[PDB]
From a paper:
FdlA from Flavobacterium sp. SA-0082 is an endo-type fucoidan-degrading enzyme that cleaves the sulfated fuco-glucuronomannan (SFGM) through a lytic mechanism. We show that the FdlA-NTD adopts a right-handed parallel β-helix fold, and possesses a substrate binding site composed of a long groove and a unique alkaline pocket. Our structural, biochemical, and enzymological analyses strongly suggest that FdlA-NTD utilizes catalytic residues different from other β-helix polysaccharide lyases, potentially representing a novel polysaccharide lyase family. Here, we report crystal structures and enzymological characterization of wild type (WT) and eight single mutants of the catalytic N-terminal domain (NTD) of FdlA, revealing its unique substrate binding pocket and identifying the key catalytic residues.
We first measured the enzymatic activity of 12 mutants and found that eight of them (D137A, K141A, H176A, F179A, E236A, R240A, Y242A, and Y242F) almost completely abolished their activities, H279A mutant retained approximately 65% of the activity compared with WT, while mutations of Asn243, Arg272, and Tyr322 to Ala only negligibly affect their activities. Brønsted base is responsible for proton extraction from C-5 atom in β-elimination reaction. Two positively charged residues Lys141 and Arg240 have their side chains pointing closely to the C-5 atom at the +1 subsite, hence are potential candidates for a catalytic base. Our structures showed that the K141A mutant possesses an active site almost identical to the WT, similar to the Y242F mutant. In contrast, Lys141 possibly functions as a catalytic base by capturing a proton from the C-5 atom at +1 subsite. Subsequently, abstraction of the proton occurs on C-5, a process that is presumably accomplished by Lys141, leading to the formation of an enolate intermediate. While it remains considerably challenging to unambiguously identify residues responsible for proton abstraction and transfer without structures of FdlA-NTD in complex with substrates or products, we were able to infer from our crystal structures and docking models that Tyr242 and Lys141 serve as the potential Brønsted acid and base, respectively. We found that the inactive FdlA-NTD mutants exhibited similar Kd values as the wild-type form. These binding assay data clearly demonstrated that while our inactive mutants lost their catalytic activity, they maintained their substrate binding ability.
Numbering used by the authors: 1 to 443
């Protein structure tokens, strides 16, 4: 009792219905500007609004191309390609691609998951169309921007017990790739998440062209001219949780923080951060992940990161978010470089807050001269130089267990205290803190 349909026009009615089992015939389906409007197939945004419950949709060998001009076809309103509002739905195997480079009139999300107990599996997403594209967040990702933005993010997970599984999410757009707002018990599992990078030196080479960055003389939102020597993502977070948001379950509007997020066996590459769950409440659990060439590896604030790896070519594998972080437990492998080193942060980890149990493993024997494990101190972080974002730099660290099973050096700043350090070698450890103990071990 599986119904097969052969066009987007024949598909749309089933999106309103409960308990359906629908298949969209293999093929390549184009949505264009001429397809959006009053008499046209799509008169409202979101384009594909899944309102029914207990339904399954098969998109095997479906290619769905959406021209980015569609993001300008609904006025000054947010545009979403896919939004799920019902419960207990399963969508599988869709290949979806944004065509062109037109930015939203307002902003856009490819996929938004409200409701409860939904699952998207096997999707292959390619996200395009945003402004500005090519600077990451250097000229603004929020209010008071130097260059006003019209962002386009990938998958927004909200709702309750919603599940993103075995998907591939490629972003070539300024926005988060996967993020969570007001999501309770979200799970991201088995996914490949990929952005692209650009050095600040390359951006600075736009001088004299009349580019948007040139017209503001490269003055960042952080308060200083864009510094040379860093690698940025052109995207925002790889997997990022927010401590607020709006979601809709059973028609009821809800405003709440993300809580109890789980991330399992994902690979994140070339994003501003691999996994950042520090703003979520509840239990944060990250296991089996691989983060390559991100500006920041893991920042969950408090919780567990276990059996995870990250390389350190563009930024630290580990960072505490604020000086108030408490109970971050982590076992992170520093992986072999996935590309040439270009790390202006001068750190493999920045540690502060209290009551952390931290283990770093690595087989690296060629240690770049600028890379070290920092407990407290003045991080040379791209966004925290010269007193900017001061709550995210220069904080104290106390009552922390640090197992340095690597050849990287450790610098314990004067603001650190009661740090118990276990290291392969103790000769490359600087201790300027109070009541810290340094004990060597074999291997």
């Amino acid at each position: 009792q599986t119904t097969t349909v052969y066009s987007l026009e024949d598909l749309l009615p089933y999106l309103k219905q409960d308990n359906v089992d629908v298949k969209l015939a293999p093929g390549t389906y184009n949505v264009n500007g001429f397809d959006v409007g009053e008499d046209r197939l799509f008169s409202t945004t979101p384009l594909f609004l899944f309102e029914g419950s207990n339904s399954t949709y098969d998109f095997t060998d479906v290619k769905l191309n959406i021209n980015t001009v569609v993001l300008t076809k609904f006025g000054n309103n947010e545009v979403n390609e896919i939004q799920i509002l019902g419960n207990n739905n399963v969508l599988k195997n869709l290949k979806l691609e944004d065509i062109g480079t037109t930015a939203p009139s307002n902003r856009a999300q490819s996929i938004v998951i409200d409701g409860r107990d939904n699952r998207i599996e096997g999707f292959h997403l390619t996200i395009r169309g945003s402004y500005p594209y090519g600077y990451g967040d250097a000229f603004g990702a929020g209010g008071g921007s130097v260059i006003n933005h019209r962002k386009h993010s990938g998958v927004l997970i909200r709702g309750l017990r919603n599940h993103l599984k075995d998907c591939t999410i490629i972003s070539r757009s300024y926005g988060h790739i996967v993020f969570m707002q007001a999501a309770s018990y979200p799970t991201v599992e088995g996914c490949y998440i990929e952005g692209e990078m650009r050095s600040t030196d390359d951006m600075l080479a736009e001088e004299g062209t009349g580019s948007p960055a040139d017209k503001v003389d490269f003055m960042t939102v952080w308060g200083y001219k864009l510094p040379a020597g860093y690698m940025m993502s052109l995207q925002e977070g790889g997997i990022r949780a927010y401590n607020a948001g709006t979601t809709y379950i059973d028609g009821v509007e809800i405003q709440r923080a993300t809580d109890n997020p789980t991330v399992l066996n994902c690979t994140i590459k070339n994003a501003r951060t691999g996994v950042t769950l520090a703003h979520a409440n509840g239990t944060k659990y990250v296991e089996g992940c691989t983060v390559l060439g991100c500006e920041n590896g893991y920042s969950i604030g408090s919780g567990t990161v276990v059996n995870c790896g990250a390389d350190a070519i563009y930024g630290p594998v580990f960072k505490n978010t604020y000086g108030s972080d408490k109970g971050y437990n982590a076992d992170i492998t520093i992986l072999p470089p996935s590309d040439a080193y270009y790390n202006g942060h001068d750190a493999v980890a920045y540690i502060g807050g209290s009551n952390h149990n931290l283990t770093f493993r690595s087989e690296i024997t060629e240690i770049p001269s600028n890379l070290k494990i920092m407990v407290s101190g003045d991080l040379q972080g791209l966004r925290v130089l010269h007193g900017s974002n001061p709550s995210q730099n220069n904080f104290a660290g106390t009552n922390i267990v640090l197992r340095n099973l690597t050849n990287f050096p450790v610098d314990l700043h004067s603001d650190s205290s009661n740090i118990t350090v276990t290291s392969c070698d103790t000769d490359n450890i600087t201790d300027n803190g109070t009541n810290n103990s340094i004990e060597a071990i074999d291997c």
